[PDB]
Write a protein that binds this ligand. Structure first.
Ligand SMILES: Nc1nc2c(ncn2[C@@H]2O[C@H](COP(=O)(O)OP(=O)(O)O)[C@@H](O)[C@H]2O)c(=O)[nH]1
Ligand SMILES: C[C@H](CN1c2ccccc2Sc2ccccc21)N(C)C
Length: 169
């Protein structure tokens, strides 16, 4: 069993805790405080390998910058989640990519672009927009929903596989 640290990165309100809890407790949560930051452990047999995925639902602003940079350095995978009905959080993705690349001091970082709330209207972020952005970062992009659970398992599985490829590079 290989232990893998899967951290979710995104803006406050994209559904970090929701998507995480959905796969951990197998149920959607409508009300959950965004300040709640905790990690969850889940052993999944991916490709014949039982990997222990340690998913982290971070809050945002830490008490100390060192701790911030620390959890980012030990993080193996970074799930970039945004809202398809919000351009603000979509543009915030550039900040995360830039930051993580500096914090880990590495350009090759296993990331996966995930567009949550694909079942909701007012879609401002075009699929082509996100796809092009993902291609520019050399990472995959999957539309998901914490409600319909569409492509959720796939998005997470891909993230783990991306890490693997980076490890066996
Ligand atoms: N409709 C809809 N609401 C979501 C979705 N994901 C999260 N939310 C809601 O966003 C609010 C905060 O969710 P939370 O788990 O705190 O996500 P976070 O604060 O971004 O980490 C709650 O009302 C969640 O139910 C989603 O995919 N669809
Ligand atoms: C995010 C932390 C655990 N953690 C960590 C804690 C303090 C300093 C550095 C780190 S390394 C890290 C990396 C990935 C997931 C969680 C952490 N905990 C709130 C779950």
């Amino acid at each position: 069993m290989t232990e893998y640290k899967l951290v979710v990165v995104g803006a406050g309100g994209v559904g970090k805790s929701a998507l995480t809890i959905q796969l951990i407790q197998n149920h959607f949560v409508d009300e959950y405080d965004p300040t709640i930051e905790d990690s969850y452990r889940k052993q999944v047999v991916i490709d014949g390998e039982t990997c222990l995925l340690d998913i982290l639902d971070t809050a945002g602003q830490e008490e100390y910058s060192a701790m911030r940079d620390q959890y980012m350095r030990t993080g193996e995978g970074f799930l970039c989640v945004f809202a398809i009905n919000n351009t603000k959080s979509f543009e915030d993705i550039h900040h995360y990519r830039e930051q993580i690349k500096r914090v880990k001091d590495s350009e090759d970082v296993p990331m996966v672009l995930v567009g949550n709330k694909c079942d909701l209207p007012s879609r401002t972020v075009d699929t082509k927009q996100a796809q092009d952005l993902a291609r520019s970062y050399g990472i995959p992009f999957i539309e998901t929903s914490a409600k319909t659970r569409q492509g959720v398992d796939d998005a997470f599985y891909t993230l783990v596989r991306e890490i693997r490829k980076h490890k066996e590079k």
